[PDB]
Design an enzyme around this catalytic site. Structure first.
Site, mmCIF file in Angstrom:
data_model
loop_
_atom_site.group_PDB
_atom_site.id
_atom_site.type_symbol
_atom_site.label_atom_id
_atom_site.label_comp_id
_atom_site.label_asym_id
_atom_site.label_seq_id
_atom_site.Cartn_x
_atom_site.Cartn_y
_atom_site.Cartn_z
ATOM 1 N N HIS A 116 5.994 -0.412 -3.074
ATOM 2 C CA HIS A 116 4.686 -1.042 -2.943
ATOM 3 C C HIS A 116 4.692 -2.102 -1.848
ATOM 4 O O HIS A 116 3.723 -2.229 -1.088
ATOM 5 C CB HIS A 116 4.282 -1.646 -4.284
ATOM 6 C CG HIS A 116 2.845 -2.046 -4.360
ATOM 7 N ND1 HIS A 116 2.445 -3.357 -4.490
ATOM 8 C CD2 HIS A 116 1.712 -1.307 -4.333
ATOM 9 C CE1 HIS A 116 1.127 -3.409 -4.536
ATOM 10 N NE2 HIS A 116 0.658 -2.178 -4.440
ATOM 11 N N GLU A 120 4.366 -0.320 1.359
ATOM 12 C CA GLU A 120 2.985 0.110 1.549
ATOM 13 C C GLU A 120 2.126 -1.033 2.071
ATOM 14 O O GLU A 120 1.281 -0.834 2.950
ATOM 15 C CB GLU A 120 2.424 0.647 0.234
ATOM 16 C CG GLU A 120 0.932 0.938 0.247
ATOM 17 C CD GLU A 120 0.396 1.261 -1.128
ATOM 18 O OE1 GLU A 120 1.209 1.494 -2.041
ATOM 19 O OE2 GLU A 120 -0.839 1.278 -1.299
ATOM 20 N N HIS A 121 2.319 -2.237 1.534
ATOM 21 C CA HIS A 121 1.520 -3.374 1.989
ATOM 22 C C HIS A 121 1.935 -3.835 3.379
ATOM 23 O O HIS A 121 1.096 -4.290 4.161
ATOM 24 C CB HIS A 121 1.626 -4.525 0.995
ATOM 25 C CG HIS A 121 0.617 -4.462 -0.104
ATOM 26 N ND1 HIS A 121 -0.517 -5.242 -0.116
ATOM 27 C CD2 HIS A 121 0.566 -3.709 -1.226
ATOM 28 C CE1 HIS A 121 -1.221 -4.975 -1.200
ATOM 29 N NE2 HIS A 121 -0.585 -4.048 -1.891
ATOM 30 N N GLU A 164 2.494 -11.884 1.836
ATOM 31 C CA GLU A 164 1.911 -10.902 0.932
ATOM 32 C C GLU A 164 2.353 -11.076 -0.512
ATOM 33 O O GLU A 164 1.851 -10.361 -1.388
ATOM 34 C CB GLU A 164 2.268 -9.484 1.386
ATOM 35 C CG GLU A 164 1.574 -9.058 2.657
ATOM 36 C CD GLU A 164 0.066 -8.998 2.505
ATOM 37 O OE1 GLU A 164 -0.409 -8.436 1.498
ATOM 38 O OE2 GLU A 164 -0.644 -9.522 3.387
ATOM 39 N N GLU A 189 -2.237 -8.490 -7.605
ATOM 40 C CA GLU A 189 -2.399 -7.073 -7.915
ATOM 41 C C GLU A 189 -1.627 -6.691 -9.171
ATOM 42 O O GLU A 189 -2.114 -5.909 -9.992
ATOM 43 C CB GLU A 189 -1.965 -6.220 -6.729
ATOM 44 C CG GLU A 189 -2.939 -6.290 -5.572
ATOM 45 C CD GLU A 189 -2.609 -5.319 -4.465
ATOM 46 O OE1 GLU A 189 -1.537 -4.688 -4.530
ATOM 47 O OE2 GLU A 189 -3.422 -5.189 -3.527
#
Ligand SMILES: CCCCCCCCCCCCCCCCCC(=O)OC[C@H](COP(=O)([O-])OCC(O)COP(=O)([O-])OC[C@@H](COC(=O)CCCCCCCCCCCCCCCCC)OC(=O)CCCCCCCCCCCCCCCCC)OC(=O)CCCCCCCCCCCCCCCCC
Ligand SMILES: CCCCCCCCCCCCCCCCCC(=O)OC[C@H](COP(=O)([O-])OCC(O)COP(=O)([O-])OC[C@@H](COC(=O)CCCCCCCCCCCCCCCCC)OC(=O)CCCCCCCCCCCCCCCCC)OC(=O)CCCCCCCCCCCCCCCCC
Ligand SMILES: CCCCCCCCCCCCCCCCCC(=O)OC[C@H](COP(=O)([O-])OCC(O)COP(=O)([O-])OC[C@@H](COC(=O)CCCCCCCCCCCCCCCCC)OC(=O)CCCCCCCCCCCCCCCCC)OC(=O)CCCCCCCCCCCCCCCCC
Ligand SMILES: CCCCCCCCCCCCCCCCCC(=O)OC[C@H](COP(=O)([O-])OCC[N+](C)(C)C)OC(=O)CCCCCCCCCCCCCCCCC
Ligand SMILES: CCCCCCCCCCCCCCCCCC(=O)OC[C@H](COP(=O)([O-])OCC[N+](C)(C)C)OC(=O)CCCCCCCCCCCCCCCCC
Ligand code: HEM
Ligand code: HEM
Ligand code: HEM
Ligand code: HEM
Ligand SMILES: CCCCCCCCCCCC(=O)OC[C@H](COP(=O)([O-])O)OC(=O)CCCCCCCCCCC
Lengths: 476, 228, 47, 51, 364, 51, 92, 91
Positions: free
Chosen positions: A70, A73-74, A143, A150
């Site tokens: 993840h 992905e970010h 992030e 999230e």
């Protein structure tokens, strides 16, 4: 009442299942010498979905890297060597499209829906962000809070939390039994640029990637673009091939303030590519689904057995009648979660918790396990045909739109190595036999260890030991 | 019967179904105890012609009658447009497809010319046997004595009572309480308050029969052979 | 009854020993579900 | 369970003493033809006659 | 909270004096338990000195051992009379609907029959010995085990002191199981309440507190029943017995007529009216099993009302049972009464207790 | 099988038993060896042989 | 009645805790199997005495038929009543 | 409903093997009841026959009457031992 019900004496007309098979253009697939695959299904239109599918999910973590997929992905969206985040956004907005990234336990995909004239630009942006992302360390520290938020909000989705509990209980000691986002300790401090770069180098290789086009697209153009951009991808080590063991057991979350109780019961099955996949799908359709709006209108032996318990007056010779006040079941749904080498076939039930120390969930699970044993023993031709017909329809209902078709093409290319033509699939679907389905059911259900996940008031949901004692029968 | 003219035009009989009752079997199965052994077989039977005979509702003739009357109602609704009204008639209305009449509601004004001597005996028996029990002197209707039991309850019966309109339910309960109070002293109502046989309306049998049919509906349209 | 008493004693003790061994194994097996149970408490929000 | 049930039941069988008086044997070579002799057996006197 | 005591349980106002039969039966159960416990504390079970210690030690050495013994005998007789009236009432008011109460009652009836038989055996007199002999001979007809089982039961080829000791222990034990079953009987009744003269579904405003009104009614009816019962204890002390039981048993001599107690005669009739022994045993077992209500189990069944025809047939049942008992005892000298005995038994065996709605149906 | 509609039908009252699952039963002949072995094994006597 | 009251209030265990249903376990069949195991062990111990120490829990003078004219040298009750007997000997 | 049978009663997990003493006492109560019922079926209570009928009839006329008597005796003794352990644990 005073109004008669003529339906109880009338003769009703039974609709029959008729299938429509409109042929579609074949899926064209090519492979570069590197091994990168290029698959496309063209169809007349004005839009098309172009995407990159990677065979590297969160399955390949070790509780040290958990969440790195993840995080990657970010980080892919925060700028490349040539462009920046604002430049990528500006290009996408000029094209009038969005860039969607989707990460799961086995596959990831970055896709864009565009016009046929923006295909080269979309492929250029995808290749640039995938192969040439800088992934600077400072951005990695920016992030962390977004990913924490999230994680906080995905922890509020009860169905997702239940499936995560089920996977954690079923697979312990392998990355397949880990959360996609990972624990907070990993999000806030542990995950590092070194981990992200190691993951990308290990898992983003030639034979692990496909470029999928659906809709008004040209296979020749896609092949040329793939050669231009993805021709230099490395051919690293093959995909890890270990042993993922299934640990039968239970994971129960007690939240007595919740308004509904969610229970998932699953059994171990072989992988996605195993020759029993079609039989397992037919079993999943055999168990069927049910929702509260139907009332007594359940179309499977499974749901019926569980739903008529709350409509039966339950009159006995030596005991008082005990009829349920109302139907507490909110929904029932069979499901199958397959993976390259394993699977979880089961059912997911949502119903009201009921009064403290009642018998609602005892009855629900009693009849559920009884029906699983019964289908392990004997299946009727009518229900067998119903299950196959519904599987046909369900397979056709998953392909509504270029995005859905592209996702299907990519998933099958990554899983089986090529896309099975639907006609061919149907050719194999009507060759199944009732006895074969019965054997498949008996091999995985009868006297086996399940995995149970529970969320909600656990003062009424039976414990694991009891549920382990109802996978077999004394006289069977 | 008040329904007879309708039955006249559908090609059916104007006579009550209380007549025509007959024995078709030798053994009565499943054998039910606590009958004594020979009686448990059912070879020799003792009846007073006032049994319920519920299981004879599972017939094609009764369904044909019900659907004929329902088709008459629907035809009238199509002609006039009062569908709502015609589907909300009280089951004691002779036009309701599930209308039911006790044999004594027409025994005094019966045709009696087409009856066999056995059927004439049945008519006289119905009247006199009603007189013997003296539920007409308790200010009670026969259907008031159809009551459910705590154990081995008659399921249909309970539903048949919940389908009654509220006022009719309350009147039934009040009649039962008055009969209870009378029975304390084994007293009867004044002779002028005796229930005339034609006033002994079967207000619960239509609901009972409708419930029976609705319960059998799912059996004849199974989802699967091995289904609950 | 000296000899019959001794003989019956040996037989009964042997049979009870077999039963005890088997039932002890099964008890240990059934206790495994609980002897390995694990707990986790979701933390609160503290300053 | 099997042996225990059999053993508890066997506590209700005839006593050895009753199994000693049940069977007796007489010498029929002592009685001549046409002579009746009385003996004792389970209390009830028994006539043995050389018919 | 005295008020909470009053309202602990409430019943219907339609409880006629006929609904004290259960209370009277409980009274006689208590009397039997007490008098039997007093007798058993002076009793030795053995063929040598059983008949002697009843008639010479218990009766003539204690102050009122005779009165204890007469209480016990006539209490058994009156317990059976009250139980028969109790069953007749429960059949009259269609009380087979109280399924649990009825089944427990039938089990209790079988237990009490066994208790009465084993008790009568303990007086080692002529009638006791030969009633045992006849019953155990009926045991001998079972296929493939009649003699092995008979030997096991008797402890030998002949009734002896070990047989008396077995009977004594069983007679002592069974009444306590009977007390437990009486407790369960009452528990079920309180769960489903009583019927009364007529059946009604009453709310709390139509029901009355059980205590103390029905307790006082029970006291009144029990007082009258005890007057009637004591008219027999003191003035007809051997009306229900047989004089041959005042003779010490001779295994070598058979009585002229072997007749059981008046509350077992119906069963005896079934034995006499069936020439084949195995068929007689089968019919006895089926009779006792068909008195219960254990079938159907999962088929839907419900009970409707009762009517004048059924009540008249109930009177006929009573008549047939009484005549069958008398004839069964008469047939030992008069052979022509076999016709009437068989006729009465046939009429009894074909009596409808439960009117089955399955009498009416259609065919596929 | 009985050629009669003599059974009351209730909304959800079917497939009821106390031994197992209806429609998931073995052929009754598979219990024959079990019953035979059980009958032969149980129907035996045992004595201590004390004199 | 003992068992009814216990099932009303449940068992203490090694330590006293108030447990919700998630911290408790089903009685059947685990505790029945443990009871069978412990019962078989204690029955072994019991039968060791039945067949090899049949008269260890007794006094031999009870094999002498009663003689109302003679008193034993020492009158002693069974081992399980001895404490009560002591309460009588220690109070003049 | 086997599940309903499992969950009809639940206890703590801290039931150490010391909590089976009640079950042991139950076993011995059953043993005493059965043995006593068998003995009473062969017993006469009197000053002229009691002692004799135990040592000359029960223990020498039956196959294992001696075994039944030894069961009764030692079962009483062990019932008391187990009850004392039960009380001590309860304290
Ligand atoms: C004493 C009588 C003993 C025989 C007997 O059962 O008689 C009653 C039995 C039927 O009695 P019932 O009360 O009418 O039963 C109606 C049922 O629907 C049962 O009617 P049913 O005729 O079906 O019952 C007989 C049935 C066998 O029936 C059964 O297996 C179940 C029902 C048995 C009857 C009830 C129990 C009897 C004990 O026979 C068969 O199934 C033969 C094979 C048919 C195959 C299907 C058709 C061809 C394709 O047979 C007769 O009555 C026939 C002989 C009549 C002689 C006098 C005139
Ligand atoms: C001296 C004796 C010392 C104690 C020995 C016994 C012992 O330790 O038992 C605990 C030990 C614990 O069971 P387990 O070892 O975990 O499982 C053995 C069986 O799988 C347990 O199988 P099960 O619990 O299924 O019982 C088999 C069968 C009961 O057995 C039969 O039905 C067999 C006879 C069938 C023909 C006659 C009827 O169950 C039923 O009939 C009821 C099932 C349907 C319920 C309603 C829906 O055995 C039992 O508890 C046996 C069952 C006891 C009755 C309740 C069920
Ligand atoms: C090294 C490795 C050893 C093996 C591993 C092991 O122990 O595993 C634990 C495993 C089970 O442990 P657990 O899970 O805690 O469960 C054990 C108990 O359930 C629970 O055990 P607990 O920890 O709860 O304790 C039992 C508790 C609760 O009570 C009971 O559990 C009942 C038994 C209490 C004691 C006996 C009372 C008897 C009363 C009636 C007597 C009647 C006599 C009649 C005689 C008649 C003669 C004619 O009672 C006591 O603790 C009191 C007894 C203390 C004994 C030691 C006294 C030492 C000082 C002596 C001073 C001088 C005296 C004069 C000379 O196995 C054992 O415990 C086996 C026994 C080990 C004993 C020795 C331990 C090391 C020392
Ligand atoms: C004398 C018996 C008369 C009788 O049973 O009549 C009833 C019968 C009909 O009764 P059923 O058909 O309900 O039953 C016959 C009687 N059992 C039940 C005993 C078999 O009536 C007739 O037969 C009418 C005869 C005249 C008309 C032709
Ligand atoms: C007869 C049936 C007895 C009970 C059956 C039972 O519980 O079986 C499962 C239990 C075993 O249960 P289990 O828990 O080991 O396994 C059940 C689940 N399977 C089969 C998938 C492994 O079997 C036994 O206990 C075997 C012996 C039963 C007693 C047989 C007595 C016969 C006596 C005959 C003469 C009288
Ligand atoms: C635990 C309670 C009971 C004990 C201890 C007991 C004990 C005895 C004893 C020792 C005898 C033989 C003495 C004698 O015959 O006078 C006897 C006789 C008898 N008992 Fe009981 N009994 C009990 C309860 C009952 C009950 C409930 C009945 C049922 C009616 C009953 C019926 C009889 C009969 C019929 C006799 C023989 C009558 C007779 O002497 O002629 N007993 N009982
Ligand atoms: C020991 C003998 C018995 C005793 C002491 C006993 C006691 C009682 C008592 C106290 C009641 C409630 C009060 C009453 O209604 O009279 C009762 C009710 C009843 N008993 Fe018994 N009973 C006995 C034997 C039987 C037998 C053999 C049956 C037959 C099945 C039976 C069937 C019933 C029924 C049906 C009722 C309820 C009747 C009704 O309210 O409709 N009893 N009994
Ligand atoms: C026949 C003798 C006895 C039997 C059969 C018996 C049986 C039982 C049984 C089965 C239990 C539950 C299982 C257990 O916890 O061990 C129990 C618990 C208990 N018994 Fe007894 N018992 C007997 C004597 C006694 C005595 C004399 C006492 C002393 C007052 C006693 C006090 C208790 C207590 C306090 C508990 C609960 C302990 C706890 O869980 O905290 N029992 N008994
Ligand atoms: C209903 C159940 C019982 C019956 C019928 C019964 C009957 C008898 C009989 C007839 C005897 C004398 C025969 C003999 O001494 O060997 C006896 C002795 C004895 N009984 Fe019981 N009994 C019962 C229960 C118990 C119980 C629960 C205990 C207590 C643990 C007990 C303790 C004893 C003792 C200590 C003796 C004398 C031991 C000895 O002979 O040295 N009995 N019993
Ligand atoms: C409840 C289950 C747990 C109990 C387990 C203990 C079982 C008893 C083991 C002894 C069984 C035995 O030895 O029987 C063999 C003998 C000889 O018989 P035969 O085959 O030679 O005729 O047969 C005989 O000797 C006849 C009677 C034997 C006496 C048995 C005593 C029972 C003791 C129970 C202990 C709790």
């Amino acid at each position: 009442m005073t109004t008669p019900s003529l339906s109880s004496i009338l003769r009703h007309t039974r609709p029959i299942f008729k299938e429509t098979l409109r042929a579609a253009r074949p899926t064209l697939q090519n492979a570069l010498p590197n091994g990168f695959r290029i698959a496309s299904e063209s169809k007349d239109g004005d839009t098309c979905t172009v995407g990159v599918w990677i065979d590297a999910g969160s399955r390949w973590e070790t509780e040290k890297n958990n969440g790195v997929a993840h995080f990657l992905e970010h980080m892919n969206f925060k700028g490349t060597g040539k462009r920046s985040r604002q430049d990528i956004e500006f290009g996408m907005e000029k094209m009038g499209a969005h860039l969607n990234a989707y990460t799961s336990r086995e596959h990831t995909c970055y896709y864009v829906k565009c016009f046929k004239k923006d295909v080269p630009e979309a492929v250029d942006i995808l290749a640039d962000i995938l192969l040439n992302s800088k992934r600077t360390e400072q951005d990695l520290d920016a992030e962390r809070q977004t990913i924490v938020q999230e994680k906080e909000d995905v922890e509020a989705r009860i169905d997702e939390v239940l499936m995560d509990h089920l996977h954690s209980a079923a697979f312990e000691g392998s990355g397949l039994g880990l959360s996609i986002l990972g624990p907070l300790e990993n999000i806030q401090k542990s995950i590092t640029k070194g981990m992200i770069d190691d993951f990308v180098k290990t898992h983003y290789t030639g034979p692990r990637m496909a470029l999928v086009g659906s809709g008004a697209v040209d296979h020749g153009q896609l092949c040329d673009l793939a050669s231009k951009y993805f021709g230099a991808l490395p051919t690293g080590q093959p995909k890890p091939s270990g042993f993922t063991r299934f640990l039968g057991g239970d994971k129960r979350e007690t939240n007595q303030l919740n308004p509904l109780t969610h229970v998932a019961v699953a059994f171990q099955t072989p992988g996605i590519s195993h020759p029993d996949a079609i039989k397992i799908k037919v079993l999943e359709q055999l168990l069927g689904s049910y929702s509260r709006d139907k009332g007594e209108a359940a179309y499977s032996c499974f749901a019926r057995a569980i739903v008529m318990d709350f409509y039966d007056p339950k009159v006995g010779q030596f005991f008082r009648p005990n009829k349920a006040g109302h139907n507490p079941i909110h929904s029932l749904n069979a499901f199958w979660a397959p993976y390259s080498d394993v699977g979880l076939l089961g059912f997911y039930a949502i119903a009201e918790p009921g009064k403290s120390y009642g018998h609602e969930w005892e009855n629900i699970l009693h009849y559920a396990m009884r029906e699983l044993i019964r289908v392990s023993r004997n299946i009727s031709e009518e229900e067998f045909e119903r299950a196959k017909n519904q599987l046909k329809l369900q397979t056709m209902l998953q392909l509504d739109g270029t995005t859905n078709i592209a996702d299907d093409i990519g998933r099958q290319v990554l899983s089986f190595g090529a896309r099975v033509p639907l006609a061919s699939f149907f050719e194999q679907l009507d060759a199944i036999s009732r006895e074969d389905l019965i054997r498949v059911a008996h091999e995985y259900f009868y006297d086996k260890d399940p995995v149970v996940a529970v969320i909600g008031d656990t003062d009424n949901v039976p414990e694991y030991d009891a549920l382990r004692a109802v996978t077999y029968s004394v006289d069977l | 019967m008040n329904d007879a003219p309708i039955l006249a035009k559908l090609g059916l009989s104007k006579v009550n179904t209380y007549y025509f009752q007959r024995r078709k079997h030798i053994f009565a199965l499943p054998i039910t105890i606590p009958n004594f052994p020979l009686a448990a077989l059912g070879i020799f039977r003792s009846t007073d012609m006032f049994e319920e005979r519920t299981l004879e509702r599972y017939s094609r003739d009764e369904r044909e009658k019900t659907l004929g009357k329902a088709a008459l109602l629907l035809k009238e609704a199509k002609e006039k447009g009062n569908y709502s009204e015609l589907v909300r008639l009280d089951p004691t209305d002779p036009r309701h497809p599930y209308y039911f009449e006790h044999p004594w509601q027409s025994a005094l004004k019966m045709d009696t010319v087409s009856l066999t001597p056995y059927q004439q005996y049945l008519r006289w028996h119905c009247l006199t046997y009603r007189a013997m029990h003296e539920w007409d002197r308790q200010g009670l209707l026969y259907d008031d004595l159809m009551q459910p039991k705590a154990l081995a309850t008659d399921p249909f019966l309970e539903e048949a009572i919940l389908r009654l309109p509220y006022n009719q339910r309350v009147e039934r309960e009040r009649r039962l309480s008055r009969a209870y109070d009378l029975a304390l002293r084994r007293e009867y109502l004044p002779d002028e308050d005796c229930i005339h046989p034609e006033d002994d309306v079967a207000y619960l049998h239509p609901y009972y029969h409708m419930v029976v049919d609705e319960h059998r509906e799912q059996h004849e349209n199974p989802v699967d052979v091995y289904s609950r | 009854w000296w000899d019959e008493r001794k003989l019956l004693g040996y037989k009964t003790i042997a049979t009870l020993a077999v039963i005890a061994v088997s039932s002890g194994y099964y008890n240990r097996f059934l206790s495994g579900l609980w002897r390995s149970r694990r707990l986790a408490f979701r933390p609160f929000n503290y300053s | 369970t099997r042996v225990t049930v059999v053993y508890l039941m066997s506590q209700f069988m005839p006593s050895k003493s009753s199994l000693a008086l049940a069977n007796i044997e007489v010498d029929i070579g002592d009685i001549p033809e046409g002579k009746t002799v009385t003996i004792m057996w389970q209390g009830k006197p028994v006539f043995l006659r050389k018919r | 909270n005295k008020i909470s005591l009053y309202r602990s349980y409430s019943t219907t106002i339609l409880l006629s004096p006929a609904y004290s039969l259960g209370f009277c039966a409980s009274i006689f159960i208590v009397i039997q338990i007490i008098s039997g416990y007093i007798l058993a504390s002076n009793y030795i079970a053995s063929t040598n000195e059983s008949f002697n210690i009843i008639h010479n030690v218990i009766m003539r050495e204690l102050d009122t051992g005779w009165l204890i013994r007469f209480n016990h005998i006539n209490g058994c007789a009156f317990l059976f009379i009250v139980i028969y009236m109790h069953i007749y009432r429960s059949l009259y008011h269609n009380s087979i609907t109280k399924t649990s109460v009825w089944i427990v009652g039938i089990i209790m009836y079988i237990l009490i029959c066994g208790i009465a038989f084993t008790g009568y055996s303990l007086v080692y007199g002529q009638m006791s010995l030969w009633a045992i002999v006849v019953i155990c001979s009926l045991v001998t007809a079972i296929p493939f085990i009649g003699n092995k089982l008979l030997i096991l039961i008797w402890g030998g080829n002949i009734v002896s002191s070990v047989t008396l000791q077995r009977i004594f222990c069983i007679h002592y034990l069974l009444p306590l199981l009977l007390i437990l079953f009486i407790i369960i009987h009452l528990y079920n009744l309180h769960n489903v309440n009583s019927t009364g003269d007529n059946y009604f579904i009453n709310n709390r405003y139509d029901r009355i507190n059980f205590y103390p009104l029905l307790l006082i009614r029970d006291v009144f009816i029990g007082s009258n029943i005890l007057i009637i019962y004591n008219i027999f204890v003191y003035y007809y002390s051997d009306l229900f017995g047989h004089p041959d039981n005042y003779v010490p048993a001779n295994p070598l001599v058979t009585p002229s007529e072997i007749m059981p107690e008046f509350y077992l005669l119906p069963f005896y009739a079934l034995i006499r009216a069936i020439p084949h022994k195995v068929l007689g045993i089968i019919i006895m077992v089926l009779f006792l099993l068909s008195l219960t209500n254990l079938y159907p189990i999962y088929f839907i069944r419900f009970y409707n009302n009762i009517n004048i025809l059924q009540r008249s047939l109930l009177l006929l049942l009573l008549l047939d049972l009484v005549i069958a008992s008398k004839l069964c005892l008469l047939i030992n000298h008069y052979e022509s009464f076999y016709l009437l005995l068989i006729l009465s038994i046939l009429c009894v065996l074909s009596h409808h207790i439960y009117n089955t709605s399955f009498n009416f149906s259609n065919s596929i | 099988i009985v050629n009669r509609s003599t059974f009351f039908v209730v909304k959800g009252h079917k497939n009821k038993g106390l031994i197992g699952i209806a429609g998931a039963r073995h052929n009754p002949l598979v219990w024959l060896p079990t019953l035979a072995l059980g009958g032969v094994w149980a129907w035996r006597w045992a004595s201590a042989g004390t004199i």
